[PDB]
Amino acid sequence: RLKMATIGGGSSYTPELVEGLIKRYHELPVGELWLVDIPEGKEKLEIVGALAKRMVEKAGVPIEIHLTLDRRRALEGADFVTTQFRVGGLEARAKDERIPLKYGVIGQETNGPGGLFKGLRTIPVILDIIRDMEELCPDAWLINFTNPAGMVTEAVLRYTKQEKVVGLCNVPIGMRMGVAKLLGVDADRVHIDFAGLNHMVFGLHVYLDGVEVTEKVIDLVALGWEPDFLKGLKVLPCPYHRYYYQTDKMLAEELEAAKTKGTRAEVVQQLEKELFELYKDPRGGAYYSDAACSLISSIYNDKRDIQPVNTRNNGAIASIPPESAVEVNCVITKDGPKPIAVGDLPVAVRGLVQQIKSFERVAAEAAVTGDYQTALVAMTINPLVPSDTIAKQMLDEMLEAHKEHLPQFF
Amino acid sequence: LKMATIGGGSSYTPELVEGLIKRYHELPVGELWLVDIPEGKEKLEIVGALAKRMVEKAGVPIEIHLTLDRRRALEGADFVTTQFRVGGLEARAKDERIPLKYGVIGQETNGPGGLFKGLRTIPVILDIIRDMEELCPDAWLINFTNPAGMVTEAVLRYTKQEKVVGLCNVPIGMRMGVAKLLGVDADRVHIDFAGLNHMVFGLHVYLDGVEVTEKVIDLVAHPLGWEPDFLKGLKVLPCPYHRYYYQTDKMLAEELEAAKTKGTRAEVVQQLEKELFELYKDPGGAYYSDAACSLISSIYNDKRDIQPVNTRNNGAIASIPPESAVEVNCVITKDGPKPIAVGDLPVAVRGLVQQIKSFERVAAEAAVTGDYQTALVAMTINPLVPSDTIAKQMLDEMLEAHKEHLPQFF
Amino acid sequence: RLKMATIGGGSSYTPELVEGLIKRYHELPVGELWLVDIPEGKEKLEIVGALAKRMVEKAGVPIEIHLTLDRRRALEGADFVTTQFRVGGLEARAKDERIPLKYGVIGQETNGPGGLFKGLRTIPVILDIIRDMEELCPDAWLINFTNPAGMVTEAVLRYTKQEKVVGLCNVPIGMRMGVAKLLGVDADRVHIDFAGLNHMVFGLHVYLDGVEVTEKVIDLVALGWEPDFLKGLKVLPCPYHRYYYQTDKMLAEELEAAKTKGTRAEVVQQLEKELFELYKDPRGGAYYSDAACSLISSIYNDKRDIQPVNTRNNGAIASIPPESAVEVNCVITKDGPKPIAVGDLPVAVRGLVQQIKSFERVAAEAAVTGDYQTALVAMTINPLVPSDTIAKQMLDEMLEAHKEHLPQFF
């Protein structure tokens, strides 16, 4: 009987997960399910925990909902572990998205400057959690959604013995969903060759019933990409690529929404503020756990289907280290995901992905050594930072901004 | 032994035939030739007569011949070199101003300009070879004609000429540059260079063969203008072209006021050069070929010293394909340069130069094929261009700007 | 409606194939099926062609059997092409297996000296067949069983544009069948991680219902392997590995059977002589086409299951070139097989597999250039040849032996 533990129990997305297991219970015999959160989130936990406990009873599935704060008990022989928390809360994402704004620089949640400090705050906690699993459940799996998944994944590989780790995004299932509606066709008649890193993944090839239709799909993309650029690239870009191929335009959006709706996080907070109110008794942001259940299932069941996840490269992509973390199509087995080969990333886009790995790597190191000097190198080399100078300012400032979460620097 | 030189009328031919006088000791050059296009016929002869002067003032039996008919200068030629500029220096003028409109760097071998400087040159280099194989299939090819980086690269991928080297003054500069600093003879200081042209690093700095790199950096950072902690944490030593990348903002602040005030360097040079021909009638900028004489000498006498040049990677830089071109330290040999092994670039700098490789490569294919889509991909993926849309505009404006010497597009 | 063409139509195994399609017709709508053979085999063709035509009618499957000698018509818009012929007939395998015997050297059919000349005879014909498909069916697939599959595959990749090529063996399905009977368990509860080259493939990992049981399976292997060797190797060896880890013992067998039953080919010939007699009107050697139909099906159907075949490495195995041919697990899709990553081959066994690739490569070249000098290098470096001298003798002798089939050498 399966025991599952989730950290970030009081999340906005928590019901999407418990629904997912309900729809897929026949093959996923989940016994206990534990929801963990931290003291400054106890309220939101105890709210959706009941809604979970309600969704369950209304479906006749015998899933026991366990709510707790003593994380260490929820790991006591866990079988699978999911992580959907956000360190520093939404209030922290607000800082990440406005401090860059002063400087003309992107203030997104997982790219540029914000992404860096999202990691510095977070991946200590990830390693902190694993240091517990090595005592409470060393055979357990770590399935991870806490962003930046592609950097958090790289931490675990570089700084931990944990070989059992997987990361998820909704960018892949998004792009599929996706080119389906572009061809106006039942989605599972479409399969895409993914390769790249998280929030930096490409659709290398597109098949409709096994026949490549990548060219014809690309022509139909004319969120707007230049025809000649996209046609000439011969691959299909991720939504986060506008941050690198359409930078000024983006930038535009981050500026204007600040005056108006507020920042994305700010906009998020309200929508999230009033969403808990629904949860208090008797639709945007992610699918992150419709793609999480598919994975937890296939692993458990050894289904050996093909899903795009984050795992050890092992040479799937030539230019990325074998010991590093990529986001590619994997055969999904009980021993883990298993990368299908790619060869290398296409020339045109090979360097920019190389540019992001370097950033994740240096960022991951600083988050763990706590070394100011490393963190500064991290921002400056990032492609959404113009100068060492500006870099130093945002760094010195955002350091101070999240002092509470960044002890390793003091 | 018959040398031959393309772009005889260059401002730098002094620096050239001044190199040889200090090395007739080993270079039995009988007939030297200087060529140019009929559009520079005059500026050629203003210096041609200045050649025959100093080979008379130093007593050297070197036959100064001048010609427009290029092929007769490849009549049994043994060495062939290239310092010419396609489009004149008026072409460089457009490439520094058209980007200024858009906020994009208007440099001659970086960003948009670099793409176009290439797009013009490469097909001509290929033509020089096309009949270099005709009249000198045994002869060497030594090149400056920027962008040296993507000129070498293009030559490997689209020709069967194995006899190619590339030179830039960035390392030699950085040598004496760093040499001066400590305060010893250049003879007493050596550096490990790995990278590409205008993308080359002081990986380690030696003083007598003892590595002092941490010291040296700490001096540079605390006597250009580099952030201290950035420079210390990158633990290596940037090219002077790394400001366009690590200091992009400052660098375009500078390109603008210098455009209001004194004009772009193309323009500042256009006069200062049109006045240097003044002195060339009877009695700053580069080392680009004193340092590229040290080579040719070593090549003939097989001296096996250690000079930084541009040659087929052959796996010395792990992340660059072996079939591509890099700027690395090399053993010089009568059979060719032989790169020492670098391993791979440090992590923090690996993505950046991987981009430049990608840029060079795409810009190469566009220059040869003449494809618009490949060209736009070149302009978009370059780390100095903010949008597909900006890139789309600049590309059309500069294509049109140079209709004359892009006859493979039209 | 599918059109399939097979060369080597009059083969002993031909009925196993036509049975295979019969059992799997529901998903494999095979319209026409053509059986091709050559004049000196017309008799054996016209015999089993009727037995095929009989197996079909007795099953109610509407598969038209087409027998021919005009190969070029059988390819006229073929959809799939299989090759099971053997150049030089069984009489040629007799020579390959006895001429080494004089010299103390292995005389097997696809390893050592015999394998070399099996290639030199064969892979011209393979390329000869493809030179036809490029005119008659350029969208057709080439599925290949004609040994040596691992060398024949490498020819097509190196010397042909044909990207659509796959090779089969029964060694994989054999080893599975295999460790099943070793655990005494339903075979499809067992899946093995294959990696290596054809007739040189290893069972890297063994799973029973997704749990690795590789260790416990290996202990049960004690055809006998030393416990400590096999346990210490931590992988599972192919049947052809006794030729390299158990050499003298093998060698033994090839010697003794010569005195007695005759050579394998000789033994084969009788068993095959009397087997055609059964075929004339109203069980050993291979499964090579129970694994062929599984593949032709999955490709056609896009089943995306996992089968171990021979395809372009593309970095699936680090130490083997990306452009070369390996024998690994592949996801099987309509665009082709798709290698799951391996990383590299385990250290212990990495070199011996490297040793075989080199042999296939040099052998493949000589078979096509016809260069004596290359062929000599081929044998001498092979691991079952003791000296350049002996090498030269068997080479000079077997050259003469198969002059008729080896025109490229004269």
Added chain:
Amino acid sequence: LKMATIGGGSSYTPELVEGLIKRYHELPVGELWLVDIPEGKEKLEIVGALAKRMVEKAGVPIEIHLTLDRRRALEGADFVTTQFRVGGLEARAKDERIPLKYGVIGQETNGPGGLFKGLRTIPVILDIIRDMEELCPDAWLINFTNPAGMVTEAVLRYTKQEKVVGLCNVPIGMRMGVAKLLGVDADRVHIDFAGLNHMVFGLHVYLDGVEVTEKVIDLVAHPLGWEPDFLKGLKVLPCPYHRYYYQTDKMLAEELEAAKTKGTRAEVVQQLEKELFELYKDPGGAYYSDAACSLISSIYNDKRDIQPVNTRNNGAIASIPPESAVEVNCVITKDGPKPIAVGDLPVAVRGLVQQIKSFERVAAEAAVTGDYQTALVAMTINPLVPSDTIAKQMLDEMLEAHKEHLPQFF
């Protein structure tokens, strides 16, 4: 500057302190030390007094000190070298005879013997380092103590000593060897060496820096004993240890009659050496350390010449891991040797040396761990051992043969 030498009592110390006299010019060696184990105390002093002679006959202020207490000789030592033999030359006796029983090569650094010569040495080298870090963490380590190939390798993988070089006379031999041939000064001939120890190739041969390799080969093949066409088609130039591999049969014909007749070289040497100490009382085999003086000199004065040595691959040989050891040409530098890049080995020879790498690697791990299973895998996979079964027997016989100085097995 205090040199220190382990295996002072070696037969070759003449060749050592004769090197230095021709290079006191640049080597300020004050106190030199010569050490050995108490079991060679006498043979040490027979030559120790011969040291103090020639540093008196040439007028050199080098303090010849002798000691058994090894550590006092590492008292502030600056250079450390190794020529000792573990087990005496009586141990080499067993390793050349025990294989003879089985038909297997009884060489000292190839096949079974090589494995065992290693299995004895490696753990001792690691011990010398274990306290070299104690008393000379700044000091270099230069090694001959065969097998040089797997001694270097082991040191990289199981120690943090970066300061290591390895020497063998095979290349220097092959130099003058090939130099002699044509008939010019050695100063006028250079070769490109790529491979491993006793597994090193003349990739190209230069005469003044012009490549004459095709000529040179055609001379060697038509004035050892190499097949003409084999040697011409391999287009490179084998080590004299490639007969054990490309001529295995002839090589054991020779080891047998030489065993009947004159005895094994261990024995032939045992006397010829016990009689060379005769002359060492008052007034053939190697260059293994005249050529390894040329190094130490270059290392101190940073001469940056080109000598073939054994160092961390660092990617110079593509197929060898970068973390492993190769025998390649190198630039010699006060910071260390710096391999020129080879690219990869030619195809025909790549598998062979990949095996030797595999052999070296396994033999290393067995020597350190002391695992029986790892040891048998080492003996079986070696390309000179015919069976697991033969290997099983030899391994037990030689383990027992050397119980004394394999204390990590017992």
